[PDB]
């Protein structure tokens, strides 16, 4: 490499870090997701949500 093609080198050829930061002071602070069923069955289940007084009676 030479000239402008050499200047470009850091952005074109040199590798970037995906493991940007370790566990301490961040790093893996954004890998927590809520463990929902992802397709709950809303048949037998969908009683108490809307018609709850009937179940008490």
């Amino acid at each position: 490499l030479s000239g402008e093609a050499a200047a470009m080198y850091g952005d074109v050829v040199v590798q970037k870090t995906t493991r940007a930061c370790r566990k301490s002071e961040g790093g893996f602070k954004d890998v927590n997701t809520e463990l929902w069923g992802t397709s709950p069955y809303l048949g037998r289940g969908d009683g108490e949500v809307y018609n709850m007084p009937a179940s008490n009676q």
Binding site: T38, P40, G43
Partner: protein
């Protein structure tokens, strides 16, 4: 010199090939996809597991769509090497796919072997057996864990994965009937094997997890999936012994746009026997020795490719009083139709006639709509079963239209139709659009 010579050798008739280029083969472009994960999760099985029992599972609700389903068995065989023949597939006798109280599909013991006899056509067929049989000359007492994949419309391609997220009010269930007799494990032919253990089974489902944006779209929007059903009834034949060349008109009971009709002939005593037994190598127990018998197979080599042990002489399909095509000889449906349509090799005794250019695929490619045909009949002509099965001099040296006398035992007729339907899912409920 070099490849440059080929490039300068450019002519007028090349304008049909490289003039005004449209594609460059050396710049592949990929489409970016929706973020997802695949997980294998165990299902809950209700009912005692054992020979002849029927158990079922309600599909656990984790993830959004499901793709493949693998039914696990652990078996120990009481027979010696070569006494088994796909025991896993014989045990998995019937599998029903049910969405909301209405059944879509039901697969049978023999269908799993017939499908394998037609559509798997390389190392997948061998690995398939590796999963479902003993293939290393294992001895008495060997224990093996078996896998039997299901081949419903949503099992072989992610494109038809069953969207559980979209099925908010209809339950998804599977029913599994287990065989009462499994060769080499609790019976040797019809003789019980004392001390045979009951199988242990598990049903595992592969779940697809979509990200947040996709989950809302799948949960709220309606869906229309193009799906495949299997339609099936068992029947009988009248295979003759000597001097008679029989023919039968088998009335078919099918509807909906059908990709193909596959069929075979069975001796119900043995699982997967589609040909006669004869005293030729690999065809029957003890074959080639003084102890050879043609009443008992060499079970591990039950399937063969020698069509002279098969009973079908010729066949045609007749629709509404008109022949659909001219009569063809049995070897046509065993070797040529699967050549043209699948490209694999079909063992003797298993026959296929396609209506589709590529019945192995999912993209529709020609169908016979049996919902707009009133009378569909399969005409079968049989070989005369006059050859002494115990004499290899005759079994390996006879004419086209005669087969082994032991062939008259192949009295059960199995005709399988695979056709299209549409799975519509709206406001949490799914079901079939066309019913007949």
């Amino acid at each position: 010199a070099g490849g440059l010579s080929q490039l300068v050798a450019y002519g007028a008739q090349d304008v049909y090939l490289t003039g005004n280029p449209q594609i460059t083969f050396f710049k592949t472009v990929y489409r970016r996809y929706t973020n997802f994960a695949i997980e294998s999760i165990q299902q809950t099985i209700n009912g005692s597991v054992g020979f002849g029992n029927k158990v079922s599972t309600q599909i656990s609700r984790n993830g959004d769509l499901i793709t493949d389903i693998v039914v696990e068995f652990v078996l120990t065989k009481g027979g010696n090497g070569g006494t088994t023949y796909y025991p896993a597939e014989e045990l998995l006798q019937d599998v029903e796919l049910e969405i909301g109280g209405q059944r879509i599909d039901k697969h049978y013991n023999d269908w799993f072997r017939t499908y394998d006899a037609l559509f798997r056509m390389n190392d997948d067929r061998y690995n398939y057996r590796r999963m479902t049989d003993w293939v290393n000359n294992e001895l008495v007492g060997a224990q093996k864990r078996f896998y039997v994949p299901l081949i419903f419309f949503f099992n072989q391609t992610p494109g038809l994965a069953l969207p559980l997220i979209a099925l908010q009010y209809h339950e998804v269930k599977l029913y599994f009937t287990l065989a009462s007799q499994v060769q080499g494990v609790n019976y040797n032919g019809s003789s019980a094997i004392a001390g045979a253990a009951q199988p242990t089974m598990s049903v595992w489902v592969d779940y697809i997890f979509l990200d947040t944006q996709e989950r809302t779209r799948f949960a709220q929007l309606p869906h229309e999936y193009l799906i495949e059903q299997l339609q099936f009834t068992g029947s009988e034949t009248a295979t003759p012994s000597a001097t008679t060349q029989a023919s039968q008109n088998i009335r078919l009971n099918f509807n909906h746009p059908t990709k193909y009709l596959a069929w075979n002939f069975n001796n119900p005593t043995n699982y997967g026997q589609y040909t006669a037994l004869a005293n030729i190598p690999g065809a029957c127990s003890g074959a080639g020795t003084a102890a050879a018998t043609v009443t008992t197979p060499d079970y591990g080599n039950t399937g063969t490719y020698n069509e002279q042990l098969a009973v079908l002489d010729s066949a045609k399909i007749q629709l509404n009083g008109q022949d659909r095509f001219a009569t063809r000889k049995g070897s046509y449906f065993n070797k040529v139709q699967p050549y043209q349509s699948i490209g694999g090799v079909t063992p003797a005794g298993v026959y296929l006639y396609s209506f589709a250019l590529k019945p192995a695929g999912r993209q529709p490619s020609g169908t016979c709509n049996f919902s707009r045909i009133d009378n569909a009949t399969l005409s079968l002509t049989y070989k005369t079963c006059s050859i002494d099965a115990t004499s290899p001099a005759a079994v390996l040296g006879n004419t086209e239209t005669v087969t082994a006398n032991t062939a008259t035992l192949l009295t059960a007729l199995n005709i399988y139709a695979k056709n299209y339907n549409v799975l519509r899912i709206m406001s949490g409920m799914g079901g079939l659009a066309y019913a007949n």
